[PDB]
Amino acid sequence: ATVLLEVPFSARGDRIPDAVAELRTREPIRKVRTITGAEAWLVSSYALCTQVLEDRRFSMKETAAAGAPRLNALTVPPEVVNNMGNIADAGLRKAVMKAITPKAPGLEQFLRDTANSLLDNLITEGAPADLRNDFADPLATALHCKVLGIPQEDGPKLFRSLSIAFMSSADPIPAAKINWDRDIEYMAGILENPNITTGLMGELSRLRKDPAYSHVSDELFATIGVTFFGAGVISTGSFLTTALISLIQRPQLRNLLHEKPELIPAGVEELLRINLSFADGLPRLATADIQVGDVLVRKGELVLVLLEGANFDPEHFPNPGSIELDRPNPTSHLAFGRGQHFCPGSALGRRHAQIGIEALLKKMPGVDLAVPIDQLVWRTRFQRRIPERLPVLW
Ligand code: HEM
Ligand SMILES: Oc1ccc(-c2cnnn2-c2ccc(O)cc2)cc1
């Protein structure tokens, strides 16, 4: 006898387990057990993953319901799970989206300057360098501070919460609540602070005093700050870090991108397609009985949408394991999700990575791992897969 198949399969973000392709071929929707002991349907094909993400009856918001089968414990108040729904009901959607485009005046130039300076410092200190702690994360953090309109120097203090905030835990985390309340007070301070007049927090401070928003709660305005900072920094830092690994391990692609950098955006779209930064399937709770492939999912059940099941599905991406820059369907991956909850920071995340990669290839064209790739230490029980340190030489 064996126990019901457990998720997640592996914390390694440099390779996909052979088990995924076998699941997808034999059972593209199938029952698994999550770290909390709940059962769930794991969906691993492109077609079923898209079907679930496009059908709002598989609810993101209902995942936070008391007594529901859980992927993991809430690290936020239950209402914050419906964050985008709350933003839209407040009439704040267009304003938040407008504040987070990579196309703000001088934002891209800021990213480039920041990436270059980080790299100069690494080059000056001498190899080995940690491309995670001293490149990708400081880059993601600096970008988000500029986007929020908050002081660059406040970035490290906010960043400190993230190794706990984005944990994927069987049980509630006391530190997540301490950090959450603390970060919420920080952002409430920012809304009151007269020096903060640019970016997202600048915009939110003005809308807050605008009579058309006078019934929007102060808790929502602060929440938007914390969540958009947290989600943005964790997602871009993790993506860029694991994309640098995929790049470092393909010196041919790396030379091609070094030599023809106009290919970097197509390069990034392939790195997004193949990325394993999301550690768990995207969770949804069935609010009706709904046929998914051979399975009738029952109202009240938990479904997990496995991004790399879709993104490595050979029926949709032939030779899925190869980065190929001339695919006919390059942005059709699910790295940013799909449907109602499609990532609102997608353009920002694309530009963060394009610029970081461009700067890396220019400054460090001989970049290579300074340790055998098995020596990378993969963070466990976390909503992202990332190496604790990314040691490189050049
Ligand atoms: C390359 C970097 C990124 C990747 C790979 C990424 C991935 C995703 C994915 C796959 C979803 C769907 C979640 C779901 O459907 O359950 C998502 C949602 C979200 N993302 Fe991004 N993301 C990235 C960058 C960003 C940035 C730059 C921000 C904003 C500053 C952001 C803020 C959000 C928010 C607030 C949601 C919730 C959307 C909703 O509930 O409707 N992420 N992210
Ligand atoms: O739009 C969002 C953003 C984040 C989350 C979230 C889920 N689990 N943790 N967090 C979290 C924790 C600490 C923090 O500062 C920010 C977010 C959920 C929905």
- Give, for 295, the enclosing helix (H) or strand (E): strand 295-297
Query: CA angle, corner 330, sides to 131 and 47, nearest 5?
Result: 110
- Ligand 2, residue 230: give the atom nearest the CA: 16
How much distance in Å is there from the Cα of 283 to the middle of ligand 1?
13
The binding site for substrate consists of 75, 83-84, 235, 299, 383
Residue 232 structural domain = 1-394
CA distances from 248 to 125, 127, 239, 251, 386 (A): 21, 15, 14, 6, 15
How much distance in Å is there from the Cα of 216 to the middle of ligand 1?
23
Nearest residue by C-alpha to atom 17 in ligand 2: 227
Residues touching ligand 2 (Cβ under 6 Å) are: 75-76, 80, 83, 161, 165-166, 180, 183, 226-227, 230-231
One DSSP character per residue, 223-255 reads: HHHHHHHHHHHHHHHHHHHHHHHHHHT-HHHHH
Contacts 24+ apart (CB under 8 A), 122-130: 122/364, 123/363, 123/364, 123/394, 127/370, 127/392, 127/393, 127/394, 128/370, 128/371, 128/391, 128/392, 128/393, 129/391, 129/392, 129/393, 129/394, 130/389, 130/390, 130/391, 130/392
Please name which ligand lies nearest the alpha carbon of 227.
2
How was this entry determined?
Answer: X-ray
Mapping DSSP to helix (H, G, I), strand (E, B) and coil, where does residue 144 land? helix
| Location of structure tokens 């300076």 | 117
CA distances from 388 to 40, 161, 195, 313, 366 (A): 29, 16, 36, 29, 22
Please name which ligand lies nearest the alpha carbon of 186.
2
Strands 129-130 vs 391-393: parallel, antiparallel or unpaired:
antiparallel
- Ligand 1, residue 341: give the atom nearest the CA: 41
How much distance in Å is there from the Cα of 176 to the middle of ligand 2?
10
Please name which ligand lies nearest the alpha carbon of 80.
2
CA dihedral 234, 98, 148, 88 (to 10 degrees): -70
**Cα 70 to the center of its chain, rounded Å:** 20
Please name which ligand lies nearest the alpha carbon of 243.
1
The candidate with the shortest Cα–Cα distance to 257, out of 373, 359, 370, 120, is 359
User: Cβ distance 102 to 232 under 8 Å?
Assistant: no
The candidate with the shortest Cα–Cα distance to 191, out of 223, 159, 233, is 223
Q: What is the tally of structural domains in the chain?
A: 1
The binding site consists of 75, 83-84, 235, 284, 299, 341, 343, 383
The binding site for heme consists of 284, 341, 343
Q: What's 369's domain CATH number?
A: 1.10.630.10
Nearest residue by C-alpha to atom 3 in ligand 2: 227
How much distance in Å is there from the Cα of 193 to the middle of ligand 2?
24
How much distance in Å is there from the Cα of 261 to the middle of ligand 2?
34
Residues touching ligand 1 (Cβ under 6 Å) are: 60, 83-84, 100, 227-228, 231-232, 235-236, 239, 277, 282, 335-337, 341, 343-345, 348-349
